[PDB]
Design a protein around this ligand. Sequence first.
Ligand SMILES: [Zn+2]
Length: 141
Amino acid sequence: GSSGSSGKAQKLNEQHQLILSKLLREEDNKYCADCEAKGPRWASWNIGVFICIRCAGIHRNLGVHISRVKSVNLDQWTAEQIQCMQDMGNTKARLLYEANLPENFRRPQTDQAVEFFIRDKYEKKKYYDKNAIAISGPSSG
Ligand SMILES: [Zn+2]
């Protein structure tokens, strides 16, 4: 029996640190966006998805230009990055990155693979669906 009666965001206004948690709570962000681990603490804002500690390490390798890894709380954040977390989040991330995946796709369990999978997945953008972002048009600001 889930009584509920929990959700007074109103009071928690202008509170990012919290918002971040609200997302993870969602089943969509309840597991890593790669290894689908249990309890994805760390999170990659540059991309807009929550990842575990193990994977996080790989992201760093990619480069501060490809993906920036940082702590969800232990580290500081900014509205600019916050909005992104939601704008993208794991939801879209799947409909984007996990869009060009094979019918019998299966997340890697061993690091030896994960490291690459994520790399060739994001770095190489192998399973990257560009069609989605087909609204590219830089105009006067
Ligand atoms: Zn992971």
